[PDB]
């Protein structure tokens, strides 16, 4: 029986006796709770540190994967020799522990990374203060809180108390959260800013509409939970931002599901509010909850505004993007078919259309396709039987890898379909998607983001990416490998073509090399090349692309990978061959050891060891040792380090600062450069 309503609740017993308990049992032996404090004022550290102090809501609101403080007052002081209790968080009418909807929180000695637990951080008289840590994959919603005391006769639990109901939201500040955004200014704009601007008009007459998202106003968070209940969205999926944003794209429009907003373009808007009269999302959302029926009426920017409120309210970073000359493909062939024969012609173009982007990893897609995902709640085309759209990886759209779910071919057509005047009379390859914009961070100005959706018009890559997309919808094989790729060195990208036919072919291709975060979120393109090659019959040809250290070393970060796209067209047949692969750079190690006591004022020897990882000789090797408070900076030069050879460097020093210190070593030579090692040291 589906647990698909946050509003519904089950009734947990307060005296949960087990077996045939004898008359005359004395339960006074056991702890009972006299009071629970959540420290939930909007000035206190829970709501401030969780960035939830702005909600007009008197209950505790926290973000998942981050700890918060509560205090439990007991009937006598908690004594771990004789007493055992746990906190419980419960959601829905049919909670189940294996579905994440009944959450036991054990009292533990030390919090464990990523795991639910509560640590006692203070005991005074009858009270214990707990640091409670939630899982960064926690279901998002409004949970009921209980304290459960375990006895030989069963569990004794606190009564239902709506005043301790606790909202747990997505956490863009938590590095283990799927919606993690590592930039504070972007978090303020895309999560915490409750007003914004939606661009409209025409390419050469750009206008701006202010919009009040109002995600912190009284009732709005509860309405967003209500929207998911009205979707009959299983609670177990509400911790997954892919599922939340996709449900949101269906539910913000009224089609199919009694969603929030009824679309109309008829210039009359009978018995409703005309789409151009709204100036924000709050009135719409609150009317949906109070009337429990769709609100009339909206168009693209109103849908986007309300969808933006939904996403930001729940904690998914989100923004509104505007596409000038936005194509509406009606037959999913990824082009505008213009016959004007108004009866045969179904496809159309809007002066502008706008939709939302929501920020998240895509663990269902290969690494490289996380980050901004296009989601669209304006009804246009059905997606798997419902008016919804996305999340579509913007990075997948750019390279035409529209095979990756969801609805990427449609969004591609919106931003870059060709106009085909049809016998084919004429082709316009540059009209659709002339400019794509979103509000800038920290101002009302316009940010051009066209380049995130597509390559520049006129460039060969824009052609090659479009043919890839149409292919995803000659007897030549294409593959590529990265030859022995070591951090700090140039390396080769080897593209091989195998021609099994008797035909001579010409090939036009591009290469895109990108840095990617460990979670699969794209960071930056650092190399882009187009090239042409001739392919003799019955032959194999390898095309080696040199990737110099300078091209990527400036944009790396911890556990980053490299993401390569290669797309080649066989010109005589127009066949497309498109591959994408990621690789992790082999990382040279530098080992730091310390010998002797590490006391502030006595001498300790630091040993820096480095092994040449290459089959080539390193020359003019500079090793540096850094360690504020531990050593003045020092340097060692090695003229030559032979292949697979190890050098060792001993450096005496006397620390000037006690406590947890750090040693950092660096190595740079004429080829391999900027490889590091580190060691934490405690200085007694």
């Amino acid at each position: 029986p589906p647990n698909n309503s946050n509003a519904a609740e089950d009734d947990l017993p307060t005296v949960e006796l087990q077996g045939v308990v004898p008359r005359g049992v004395n339960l006074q032996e056991f702890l009972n709770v006299t009071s629970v404090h959540l420290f939930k004022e909007r000035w206190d550290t829970n709501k401030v540190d969780h960035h939830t102090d702005k909600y007009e809501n008197n209950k505790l609101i926290v973000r998942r994967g981050q700890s918060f403080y509560v205090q439990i007052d007991f009937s006598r002081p908690y004594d771990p020799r004789r007493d055992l209790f746990r906190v419980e968080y419960v959601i829905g009418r049919y909670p189940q522990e294996n579905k994440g909807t009944y959450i036991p929180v054990p009292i533990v000695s030390e919090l464990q990374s990523g795991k639910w637990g509560a640590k006692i951080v203070m005991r005074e008289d009858r009270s214990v203060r707990l640091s409670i840590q939630s899982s960064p994959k926690c279901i998002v919603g409004k949970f009921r809180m209980y304290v459960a005391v375990w006895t030989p006769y069963g569990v004794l639990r606190t009564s239902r108390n709506p005043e301790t109901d606790t909202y747990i939201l997505f956490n863009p500040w938590c590095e283990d959260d799927a919606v993690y955004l590592d930039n504070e200014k972007e978090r303020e704009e895309y999560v915490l800013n409750d007003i914004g601007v939606i661009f409209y008009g025409e390419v050469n007459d750009i206008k701006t509409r202010s919009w009040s998202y109002g995600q912190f106003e009284d009732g709005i968070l509860d309405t967003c939970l209500y929207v998911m209940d009205r979707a009959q969205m299983d609670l177990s999926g509400r911790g997954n931002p892919i599922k939340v944003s996709r449900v949101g794209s269906a539910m913000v429009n009224a089609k199919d599901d009694e969603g929030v907003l009824v679309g109309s373009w008829d210039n009359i808007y009978a018995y409703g509010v005309p789409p151009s009269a709204w100036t924000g999302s709050v009135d719409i959302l609150l009317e949906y909850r109070s009337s429990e029926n769709p609100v009339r009426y909206g168009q693209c920017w109103v849908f986007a505004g309300v969808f933006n409120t939904f996403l930001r309210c729940l904690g998914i970073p989100a923004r509104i993007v505007t596409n000038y000359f936005s194509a509406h493909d009606n037959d999913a062939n990824l082009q505008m078919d213009i016959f004007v024969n108004s009866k045969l012609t179904k496809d159309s173009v809007w002066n502008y259309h706008c939709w939302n982007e929501a920020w998240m990893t895509r663990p269902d897609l290969p690494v490289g396709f996380g980050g901004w995902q296009a989601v669209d709640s304006t009804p246009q085309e059905n997606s798997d039987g419902m008016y919804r759209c996305g999340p579509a990886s913007v990075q997948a759209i750019k390279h035409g890898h529209v095979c990756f779910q969801f609805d990427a071919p449609f969004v591609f057509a919106e931003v870059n379909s060709d106009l085909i005047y049809i016998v084919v009379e004429n082709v316009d390859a540059t009209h659709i998607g002339k400019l794509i914009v979103t509000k800038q961070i920290g101002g009302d100005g316009m940010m051009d983001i066209t380049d995130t959706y597509k390559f520049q018009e006129g460039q060969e890559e824009e052609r090659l990416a479009l043919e890839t997309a149409l292919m995803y919808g000659s007897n030549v094989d294409m593959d590529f490998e990265v030859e022995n790729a070591v951090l700090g060195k140039d390396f080769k990208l080897s593209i091989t073509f195998r021609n099994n036919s008797h035909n001579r072919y010409t090939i036009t291709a591009y290469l895109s090399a990108n840095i990617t975060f460990y979670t699969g979120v794209p960071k930056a393109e650092f190399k882009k090349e187009t090239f042409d090659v001739t392919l003799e019959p019955l032959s194999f040809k390898k095309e080696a692309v040199l990737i110099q250290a300078g091209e990527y070393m400036g944009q790396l970060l911890e556990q980053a990978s490299l993401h390569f796209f290669v797309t080649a067209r066989i010109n005589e047949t127009r066949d497309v061959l498109a591959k994408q692969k990621s690789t992790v750079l082999t990382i040279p190690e530098i080992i730091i050891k310390v010998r002797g006591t590490q006391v502030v004022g006595s001498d300790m020897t630091v040993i820096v060891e480095f092994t040449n990882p290459l089959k080539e000789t390193l020359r003019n090797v500079w090793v540096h040792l850094d360690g504020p408070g531990v050593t003045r900076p020092m340097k060692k030069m090695f003229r030559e380090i032979r292949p697979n050879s190890t050098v060792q460097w001993e450096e005496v020093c006397r620390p000037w600062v006690s406590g947890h210190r750090k040693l950092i070593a660096s190595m740079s030579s004429d080829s391999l450069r900027h490889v590091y090692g580190e060691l934490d040291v405690q200085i007694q």
Partner: peptide
């Protein structure tokens, strides 16, 4: 101000 622009 969405409007379909005729071809």
């Amino acid at each position: 101000x969405x409007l379909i622009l005729p071809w």
